[PDB]
């Protein structure tokens, strides 16, 4: 349970996630120096938390964590199998990550 492929790109659209499945990872960037690694969503059926909070110096599902000290423009996530993301012009649509023959890929969200 860990997707290798990145989410696709539909000509004209935007994708985001709200519900993070247990497994999801984020690396803290800012600048970094502390003795830490990743932020890791962990939990049972009751609730779920984030394990390893981040600091910087000078020189079923879990919500998105509270902003820290020096975040960059973009924050990258490591998704898991099961994860779902949602996709200036009208349309007349959701991307899911699946695994069949030992192969993981995000299904093309038929817009």
């Amino acid at each position, epitope marked *: *349970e*860990l997707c*290798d*492929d*990145d989410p696709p790109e539909i000509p004209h659209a935007t994708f985001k996630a709200m519900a993070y499945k247990e*497994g999801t*990872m984020l690396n803290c960037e800012c600048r970094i120096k502390s003795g830490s*690694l*990743y932020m*890791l969503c962990t939990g049972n059926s009751s609730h779920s938390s984030w394990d390893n909070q981040c600091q910087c110096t000078s020189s079923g599902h879990c919500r998105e964590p509270p902003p820290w000290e020096n975040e960059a423009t973009e924050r*990258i996530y*490591h998704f*898991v199998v099961g994860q779902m993301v949602y996709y200036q012009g009208y349309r007349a649509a959701e991307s899911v990550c699946k*695994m069949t*023959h*030992g*192969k*993981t*890929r995000w299904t093309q969200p038929q817009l």
Partner: antibody
Amino acid sequence: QVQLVQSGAEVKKPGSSVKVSCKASGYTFTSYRMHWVRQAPGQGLEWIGYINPSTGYTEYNQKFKDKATITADESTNTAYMELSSLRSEDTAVYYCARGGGVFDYWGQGTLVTVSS
Amino acid sequence: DIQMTQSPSTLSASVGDRVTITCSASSSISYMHWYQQKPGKAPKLLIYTTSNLASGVPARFSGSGSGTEFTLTISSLQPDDFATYYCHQRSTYPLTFGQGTKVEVKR
């Protein structure tokens, strides 16, 4: 079918640097990540990291952070991996393996021997 | 880091025997993968997601397990089956492999 061919064996002096190739065929290059792995003599298998040819973004493990740098280019369909300051402890066989799930398509392997 | 422990390290057996290797994870994991390796070659995928046979693999292989204790079996050893075997996990970073198990011919 899908085939990835690696560069020949190398012998290096301590403190130097070397760059390894892995050319790909039988599929569309930028749709998949490429991973790297080394196998030391006697020792088991160890995962270095990956690259995505669409973006250029890399991820590593907390071992080979400041020792390796994955690189690639879509123009010629090859992935690279440079080793920074060679020590005798770096001696091993280096594999490129294609991503997309569980490892399945590997290269031939490349030997790097480091001594004075 | 999730590290894993294989056992035994070395197995001596005969054509026609039954075989069983074990891999022990430090934490609870969802699936386990297995490879086969012969001298001078890259690893070959053997069993994916804990029990499914890769294409080209003969019916005599399989696997099972859950939680922290996984295992693979061969019901009847053939001559081609002599080699080295590795377990593998991929539910968190970094990715880690097992140490190894070598199957030699008992004489």
